[PDB]
Ligand binder design. Structure first.
Ligand SMILES: [Zn+2]
Ligand SMILES: [Zn+2]
Ligand SMILES: [Zn+2]
Lengths: 196, 194, 195
DNA sequence: TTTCCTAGACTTGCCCAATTA
DNA sequence: ATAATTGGGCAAGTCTAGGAA
């Protein structure tokens, strides 16, 4: 079938695991993750921290890349991108390309790719060790379009694929989580878990 | 211009074969002998077998192209719907406007005829391997038949054309195709139909 | 011309017109009524016309189409698109915006405008029927609804299809009525019923 | 001559639930 | 448990006949 980006979990030689903040579902939450759903709920354009767990430190030049792909097989060949309303928004942080759904916050070494071959979008940052006195590395992502954006994701489930790659682009590890960009993360999360 | 869906089992005796898929609900690809219709899912493998009576010369290429089955619509270049085209992906070769792609063939070529604009994918004709009887080409349909803005629910014909390095028609065949979710349930049904 | 003749003349080549076969469905964009010898269709769509012949007209031959009002009282007036429709429909670099009738799918179209009669025509080159075919098909588009106030204004038109030579001398001639509308099928179904 | 409707019955993707191995 | 595959069914969306202003 038409090839699509790989999404299988691979801890790699460095024991790469992804972590998240345990925010709860109170009405004030801006980003909340559901361990039972392996799903992150976040608000549009707000901080979403993502934790990198490693058992041994990766080599130097190590990069961390994120990519969104549709969860369903029937839509996997579709490149996740912002709806037209959104790409057209003046919401540029000056670094990200207007069509990318995923941005990286507060990292001037942030890099964006428009795959020449697959048309696929992604954001990379250099991998940093955990801030001394720290257990893991944190990355602040932002999702720039809502799940409900007709014309975009349109209510379809998206996965965020986090890849650990050497300076040459080789795969060192991969992990993933589902994401839902919506107005009320606490409410939505509670509910979807309410279903189980 | 415009292209024919006229069989030309030619001087080589060109014929197409299809696998025996089964009718589960949602089978990936399935062909209906009675209907002469392929029923497949978007982006899934659509195997099409090439059978000749005699090996064609070298330079021979295989071409696929779609057309609307219906009279009026035959003039409308068949292509991907706006949405899918906009959010298209690719494999390093396939252009975003093409509906039909060829899977696993680093030698594939994609054409958008400058004088018809008509789109097509052509691969070299490879004689079957020693001990084989036919040669398979795997195709993928990038939009469902019901893609509003595209297929808009209208029937298409896939026309395979054997041709020489020159571009001369050496052979011709066709099949209709229905890209849908659930090719299984839909073939039964359209059979129940008779 | 001031009002070209619309008389049928198969002439030396056994020139005939053919038409597709669809019923009165709403989903039927274009439809020909043999009884009414009228063709209904809807704005901007495909109108397939079958060019039958008994004798193969020589290379260079041409097929010109022209619309004329049907009523005598309207005959001398040129059929043109309304001013509205005229300020947009110009897609397909060959078709001038005023022309009501266009042909699609032919690199060689040639638009006319009698400089002395102002009548608009779409010319094409005669072409033999497809290898295993018994007729050549032309794809016609009718650029305005017969409704266009300021355009056809509910007035019936006739399309005269002529076979001519490189010089433009007439060879054969047919014609038929066209009703550009809203979901054509019914109109025929009905047009055929008062009958 | 268009424009509304009123539904009903399909068309058709995709949910969910059972079920395989 | 655990993922993949499947079949039941559904409901958003389509076009219908059809009468009406
Ligand atoms: Zn959006
Ligand atoms: Zn599509
Ligand atoms: Zn008009």
């Amino acid at each position: 079938s038409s090839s699509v980006p790989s999404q299988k979990t691979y801890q790699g030689s460095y024991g790469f695991r992804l972590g998240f903040l345990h925010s709860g579902t109170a009405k004030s939450v801006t980003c909340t993750y559901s361990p039972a759903l392996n799903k992150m709920f976040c608000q549009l354009a707000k901080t979403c921290p993502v934790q990198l767990w490693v058992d041994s430190t990766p080599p130097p030049g190590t990069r961390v890349r994120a990519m969104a792909i549709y969860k369903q097989s029937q839509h996997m060949t579709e490149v996740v991108r912002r709806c037209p309303h959104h790409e057209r928004c003046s919401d540029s942080d000056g670094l990200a390309p207007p069509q990318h759904l995923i941005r990286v916050e507060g990292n001037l070494r942030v890099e964006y790719l428009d795959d020449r071959n697959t048309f696929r979008h992604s954001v990379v940052v250099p991998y940093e060790p955990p801030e001394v006195g720290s257990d893991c590395t944190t990355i602040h992502y932002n999702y720039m379009c809502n799940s409900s954006c007709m014309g975009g994701m349109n209510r379809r489930p998206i996965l965020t694929i986090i890849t650990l790659e050497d300076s040459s682009g080789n795969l060192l590890g991969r992990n993933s989580f589902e994401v839902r960009v919506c107005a009320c993360p606490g409410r939505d999360r509670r509910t979807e878990e309410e279903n189980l």
